[PDB]
Amino acid sequence: FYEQAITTPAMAVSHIMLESYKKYILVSLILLGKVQQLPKYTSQIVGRFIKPLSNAYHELAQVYSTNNPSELRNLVNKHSETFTRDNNMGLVKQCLSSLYKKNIQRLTKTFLTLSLQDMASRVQLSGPQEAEKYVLHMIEDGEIFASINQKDGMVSFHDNPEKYNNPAMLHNIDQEMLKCIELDERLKAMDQEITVNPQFVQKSM
Amino acid sequence: NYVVENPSLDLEQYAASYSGLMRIERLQFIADHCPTLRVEALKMALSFVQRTFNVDMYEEIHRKLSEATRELQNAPDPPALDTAWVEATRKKALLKLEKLDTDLKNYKGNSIKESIRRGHDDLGDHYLDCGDLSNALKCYSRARDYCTSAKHVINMCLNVIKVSVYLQNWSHVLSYVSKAESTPEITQAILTKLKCAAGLAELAARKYKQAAKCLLLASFDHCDFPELLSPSNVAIYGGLCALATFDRQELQRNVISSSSFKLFLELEPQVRDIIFKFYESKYASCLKMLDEMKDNLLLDMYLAPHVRTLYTQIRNRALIQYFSPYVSADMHRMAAAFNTTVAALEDELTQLILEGLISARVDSHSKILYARDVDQRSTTFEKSLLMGKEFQRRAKAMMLRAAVLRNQIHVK
Amino acid sequence: RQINTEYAVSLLEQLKLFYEQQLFTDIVLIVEGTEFPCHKMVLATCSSYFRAMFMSGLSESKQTHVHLRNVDAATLQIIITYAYTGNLAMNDSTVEQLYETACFLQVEDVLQRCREYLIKKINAENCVRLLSFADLFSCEELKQSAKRMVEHKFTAVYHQDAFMQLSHDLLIDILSSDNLNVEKEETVREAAMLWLEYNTESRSQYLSSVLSQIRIDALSEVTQRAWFQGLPPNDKSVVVQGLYKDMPKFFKPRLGMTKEEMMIFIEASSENPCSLYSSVCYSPQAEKVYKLCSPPADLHKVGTVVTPDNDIYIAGGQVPLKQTAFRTVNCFYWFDAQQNTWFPKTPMLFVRIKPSLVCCEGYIYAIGGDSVGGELNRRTVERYDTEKDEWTMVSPLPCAWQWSAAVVVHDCIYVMTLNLMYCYFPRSDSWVEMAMRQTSRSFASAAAFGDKIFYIGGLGSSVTVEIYDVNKNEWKMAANIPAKRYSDPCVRAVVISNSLCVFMRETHLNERAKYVTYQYDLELDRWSLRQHISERVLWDLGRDFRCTVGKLYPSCLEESPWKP
């Protein structure tokens, strides 16, 4: 929704548009861990003017790209009043939590079995209990497929248990198929409505 | 950065192997970057700089030697430049140069292209001896105009290559190497000198893959090439770059097929063992020799910044090849395959996995490095579903764009 | 190249010996009874007239005694010895006759040297004399360069006596030119009127032409019946002629009436990263930013001054020596208000860094500026003479100061430092102790408005203002400039539109620099918003940039192409 608001063609930049761009950066940092590049079907000077204006959120993204929660937290404290006129400061905290989650996810792609003590040291946590809680919460949300061994203080990461042999994946593919067929029917209807126009017929005749 | 402390350099051989302004530059950098040996390096430098009537760099070197001698007069608690040299050097340098200039200008009134080119080359040679870089270039850049034969073009290219190395205009070196090679129909081994100059220029230009390829083609029949680079450093330059860029089969073919780098490896047995140990998966002995090669060759001219990057690449490549034929590779054994500690290797391995090209997973429980062999189909299906989701999102975006354009919705 | 110099000197000095010791003389010059025994060789090397005098085949070819007339003995002697020893001693008086004999004898080398002397000697009091001299003898380069300096200077003075004795063609070129610098088109009108009325009816035939070059806004109003009073009696070919004559010749405003009060900036942030700094200007009326020529050889760390005659000068500065590399040079330059270029002038005696250039009584005063000497008199205060084009030392200031500013009030030099102030009395060349400030502030600028000194800012800077009165001799506080908190304003004091305005650029946290100027109410002690400089026209300038008050022509200058 934020991306669609960004791509609105406008001859004048407005505050509502400006805030939509700022919220777009925050969600991009949370979800994808980086600012998604604006498309090329684009917009008007909205793009030209906002980027210099929303410099602080780009600065937050830059430090987010450096991947340092300690440095990121220091920047947030430096720019506390800079993000305060947002009616929301939790998004910045959600960005920090997403960075911690992203670091944990990156550990799965690089480790098969990692201890809680080493995990906390790598992502700079206060202790193994916080890492144990963080892994448990992410598994609850369905973001991580791993297992913890409290007897040896180890966390064993695992790949996707989906071998794509269950009927659930087939049903999901069929649902996407139905969505795509409805998409194509709507596209054909719009193309026919386009064909009804006077200008294309005049060019054809 | 550099300027580290380390002993055991042989100053006599390194100074005698090179000759010319290249030797002058080598003695200065060695003195400037190797303390506890700068005095003799500067003493030998000034003793050679006063030869061939240097003017400006002599003052810099004499001042540095005066400072160095003053430092020696306070630790175990400054030489005179003999300014009679200034009177003597200037008076001789002017008279011969003016005599040569008078001849060439008269020859310019005689209008002979080769004579003008040869005289300009002589003027450039004198200016380089006098310590006048740009002055030599203009003389050389006027000899380039009056060329008549292919050998004249080759000599013109060699002179510009020589000067632009001192000027650090390596772009002019590479341009003239290309001109000297591609033009005259690609016992007198002339292309070998051009390839040696190109490899040195590329290496100084932060290039390793092409520089090693050019250095490997250099035939040992060139032998004496002290105006640019000694054969001893050429072998080292080729070996380090080949080890960092050339893979195993790439290394084996190129070294053997060239048959001149085998002679080069005979000159430097240390790098020959390093490459051989690299082939035979003995990286423990390979890297310990490399660290021994580090200090002896980090006080090199065009190597010191690049060698650190080259050595870092060598360490990464050695680890990649070592783990390749291993399913359950014990991190203890991999750590034992070098003088590194278990924790240090684990950090190095983790960094390599983050960067890539090792395709492995670290099992810190038993400290065993397990290789990753992901199913192609599962990843294919996952990324195909992601692509379909992105395509649906972009289709929604395009439909919304069409809706807002058809209804003429825009901010006024 | 050249040929053997060691024999070049030997032959030269030996010819001089053969000249002072008169031995090998075959031709002698007879000038007003003065004997000039010399050779045909040496006269040939310099002059191109003696080559048509000896190797021509006339009677003088065999005659050994020639009576050279219409020449001067002193001019001939210096020319002859210059051909014999090359030492062309050129003073400030005999250059006029030196050119006359050089043109008469067609001596190319001395002609170029004296032309190079006259191209440097062109100034206010001899602009008319040199132009008439440049009109008499074809010296187009001097004639054009004079004409440019002539055009501005006549408009300023228009009272020199040699202006009356000028040729008709020269006056027509001067008056019809579009380079005149006049605040009004009426001063050139009366200048022509007084020139026409200077002489008898010999100006009547030229009157039909001089009015044909002046605009018609004054060819129907007053100064038409005045000529009728001065008309020759019963002349009916002029009164009726001018009655029906002023139809054509396309009334158009001149260029001199296009000077506006503008803020000249130096050492601004260069738009293109290839260059270090640049020079720009702000237009308080046109609301645009016109570009200026770069400082001579990118002269950084310099000072600016604008005389009451509206002239810009540059003194001091350092040039990057041929990574940090900078060498200080004492070169001096003058800015051309029309050609958009810096004309070099007589350099100073000592090099300076950030010198305070102040004009007073026509003299340019450079106080301090981090001199190279460093001796007990580590100030090196020295004035510049604008009529003799030379520098003269003045009384040294009592206390050595650094990062100081100076202004001129009541025909006196007022230099300000961290807390002390000393006034220089030019008539007696002495320094007198002044009032002491209660606040320790430096790195600030002051503007002289009326009979008061306004020290604005000081230390970034702040909004502290201390007003000093010359008649009262006391430092008093007025108010503080209302600016945004948690910022670092860059204050610049300047006088514009007969009011004390401030050029203050402020920068907020994580924000770009904002440009805004305020008008300080003298009686109300309050800074009022006079105008807000939009960022769409003016970009960042930097920190070490200077500002000064002056007038420039938007027509000669060009708008700087740069994105908002």
mmCIF file of N, CA, C and O in Angstrom, chain B residues 31 91 180 205 233 311 364 387 409:
data_model
loop_
_atom_site.group_PDB
_atom_site.id
_atom_site.type_symbol
_atom_site.label_atom_id
_atom_site.label_comp_id
_atom_site.label_asym_id
_atom_site.label_seq_id
_atom_site.Cartn_x
_atom_site.Cartn_y
_atom_site.Cartn_z
ATOM 1 N N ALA B 31 64.504 2.349 2.603
ATOM 2 C CA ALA B 31 64.922 3.125 3.767
ATOM 3 C C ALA B 31 63.721 3.696 4.513
ATOM 4 O O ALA B 31 63.654 3.621 5.745
ATOM 5 N N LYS B 91 77.572 22.960 -12.889
ATOM 6 C CA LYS B 91 78.397 23.501 -13.964
ATOM 7 C C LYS B 91 78.649 22.463 -15.056
ATOM 8 O O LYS B 91 78.625 22.787 -16.248
ATOM 9 N N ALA B 180 52.692 -1.136 -28.988
ATOM 10 C CA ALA B 180 53.906 -1.851 -29.366
ATOM 11 C C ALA B 180 53.652 -3.321 -29.674
ATOM 12 O O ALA B 180 54.454 -3.939 -30.379
ATOM 13 N N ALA B 205 48.553 -1.404 -10.843
ATOM 14 C CA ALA B 205 47.216 -0.864 -11.047
ATOM 15 C C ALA B 205 46.132 -1.700 -10.377
ATOM 16 O O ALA B 205 44.964 -1.592 -10.763
ATOM 17 N N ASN B 233 62.074 -10.655 -8.471
ATOM 18 C CA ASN B 233 60.764 -10.149 -8.076
ATOM 19 C C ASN B 233 59.694 -10.501 -9.100
ATOM 20 O O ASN B 233 58.519 -10.636 -8.742
ATOM 21 N N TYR B 311 47.522 -11.814 -0.361
ATOM 22 C CA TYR B 311 47.656 -12.832 0.677
ATOM 23 C C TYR B 311 46.304 -13.179 1.286
ATOM 24 O O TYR B 311 46.038 -14.347 1.592
ATOM 25 N N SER B 364 28.999 -26.277 15.560
ATOM 26 C CA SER B 364 29.841 -25.881 16.682
ATOM 27 C C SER B 364 29.780 -26.855 17.851
ATOM 28 O O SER B 364 30.600 -26.737 18.770
ATOM 29 N N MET B 387 8.543 -15.985 -6.974
ATOM 30 C CA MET B 387 8.382 -15.278 -8.239
ATOM 31 C C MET B 387 6.911 -15.101 -8.586
ATOM 32 O O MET B 387 6.507 -14.042 -9.073
ATOM 33 N N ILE B 409 -6.654 10.425 -12.340
ATOM 34 C CA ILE B 409 -6.479 10.713 -10.922
ATOM 35 C C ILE B 409 -5.038 11.158 -10.709
ATOM 36 O O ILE B 409 -4.102 10.365 -10.857
#
